[PDB]
Write a protein that binds this ligand. Structure first.
Ligand SMILES: CCCCCCCCCCCCCCCC(=O)O
Ligand SMILES: N[C@@H]1[C@@H](O)[C@H](O)[C@@H](COP(=O)(O)O)O[C@@H]1O
Length: 133
């Protein structure tokens, strides 16, 4: 039920990503480079396994998961977390837990653009991705 999310997407706007990274304890030099990086996110499915690739000139990640089933993840900033991804209100909600902390990565389609909202602590970052053909 994840189908409109599938494809290759390019970052076209970012708000408050420095605040989100700083909340997670990312150091200033990594924040600096990240603030100038425009990732490509690729979301594919094979049966009920999703694979989400994030590619850039700086960091690169890949995760595979089944919705609703917890998985181990090592994030771009090297946090080792317990993760689960579900559909909720038509949004793809990715929850990461580690050391009693949590962060959510929520993706929603609005007017054909994929809006990624990242929340940790009080920090709320909104990143807009546009689909590639
Ligand atoms: C894979 C590219 C990551 C770029 C930024 C690296 C340092 C901060 C990492 C924070 C967690 C992951 C944020 C993902 C943001 C996104 O997908 O647009
Ligand atoms: N096992 C890991 C990942 O879990 C971690 O995310 C990543 C850091 O980002 P990058 O690969 O870009 O250094 O290193 C590996 O490839």
């Amino acid at each position: 039920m994840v189908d409109a999310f599938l494809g290759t997407w390019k970052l076209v706007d970012s708000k408050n990503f420095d605040d989100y990274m700083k909340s997670l304890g990312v150091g200033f030099a990594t924040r600096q480079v990240a603030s100038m990086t425009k990732p490509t996110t690729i979301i594919e499915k094979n049966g009920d396994i999703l694979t989400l690739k994030t590619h850039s000139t700086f960091k690169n990640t890949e995760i595979s998961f089944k919705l609703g089933v917890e998985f181990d993840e090592t994030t771009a900033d090297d946090r080792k977390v317990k993760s689960i991804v579900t559909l909720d209100g038509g949004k793809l909600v990715h929850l990461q837990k580690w050391d009693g902390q949590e962060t959510t990565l929520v993706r929603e389609l609005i007017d054909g653009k994929l809006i990624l909202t990242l929340t940790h602590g009080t920090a709320v970052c909104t990143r807009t991705y546009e689909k590639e053909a």
